[PDB]
Amino acid sequence: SKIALFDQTLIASLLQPKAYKTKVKLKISEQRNELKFEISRSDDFEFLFSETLNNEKYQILARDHDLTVDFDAFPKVIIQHLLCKNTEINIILDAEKNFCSFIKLHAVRGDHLISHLLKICSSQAVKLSTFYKSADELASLRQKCGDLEKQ
Amino acid sequence: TSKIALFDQTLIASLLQPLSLNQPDFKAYKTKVKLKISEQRNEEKELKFEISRSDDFEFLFSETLNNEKYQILARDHDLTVDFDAFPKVIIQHLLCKNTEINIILDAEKNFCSFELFSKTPGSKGKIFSIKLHAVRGDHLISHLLKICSSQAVKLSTFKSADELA
Predict the structure, then answer these.
(1) Deepest of A72, A93, B36, B142, by most Cβ within 10 A of its Cβ?
(2) In angstroms, what separates the C-alpha of A43 from chain B's closest C-alpha?
(3) Which residues contact A68 (CB under 8 A, 6 or more apart)?
(4) How far apart are CA B149 and CA A139, in angstroms?
(5) Sequence ranges of the domains in chain A
(6) Looking at the domain that runs over B1-165, which CATH code has it been given?
(7) Which residues are within 8 A (CB) of A18 and not within 5 positions of it... i.e. 6 or more apart?
(8) Where do the PISA domain residues begin and end (chain B)?
(9) Beta bridge partners of A48
């Protein structure tokens, strides 16, 4: 009930009235009524902005930026823009950090932010499953260094 | 702030919970649960119970008692002790080796019953039980971020075998 169309880490310019280039993960997906844009940062856990486009909402966005392209072919076109070297991504935040212009994205809070943070916690958890014998194995090799320092 | 910690420690608790929403029968295992009892003010005095688990990030239950809410709990568990003394009595029970903590979760993990049971002979046994609710929103966000930022300092201490050689 959610299909990823694009999921990748880009270099974006981040303005907030300071400006700095940062790595931003952009995820474009397709889902049922019941198109979604999600941006997040690996260096900032709380930073999370989204927007969900429906046919009606899209018609306004298509009028504003003079897009003749329909709702089904719009993600296909943006996906191709994201591939081009000449494409720039600029993200400008408001004073209250409630919104950001990428399309106007809103700050993701509550349950969606909880899902995001849990995914980080559980990914950072597999970090302890691989790295647990690290400090212990370092002793056997560091002892081998001093014993080989003589030769 | 107004919030004062009266008890903040890791205990061994018995955790009973249904196997799932479609299997009511219980599964039980002893686990390490961090219990925090704190005094605060909201408008008079309030007492807050918070439980969490280091092995389960989403596991976060609380309850805030006020004078009125406490009178019901005391009536229910036949506590003659007043609201100011109630945490003092709980803390003395938690000092005793014969004290048992039992946490029974519902199938949906929405609530849980936290029980303090004294195995000392002559005791009433069940000292009390308080119904704790699953913490969501901003408080859970603060909790989950603290874990993320704690697991982050894990990368600051981590040059990967110092280039092996």
Answers:
(1) A93
(2) 10
(3) A62
(4) 28
(5) 1-151
(6) 2.170.210.20
(7) none
(8) 44-94
(9) A40
End-to-end CA distance of chain A: 65
Say yes or no: A143 contacts chain B, CB-CB below 8 A. Answer: no
Write the burial class of residue B7 (CB in 10 Å: 0-12 exposed, 13-18 middle, 19+ buried): middle
* Resolution of this deposited model, Å: 2.8
What tokens does A45 get?
């856990």
> Which listed CATH number (2.170.150.20, 3.40.50.1000, 2.170.210.20, 2.30.170.40) goes with A1-151?
2.170.210.20
Tokens of A124: 């950072």
Cβ–Cβ below 8 Å for A121 and B149: no
Which residue from B minimizes the CA distance to A47?
B145
Looking up tokens 């007492």, which residue turns up?
B47
At residue A81, what is the residue type?
Answer: H
Identify the experimental approach: X-ray
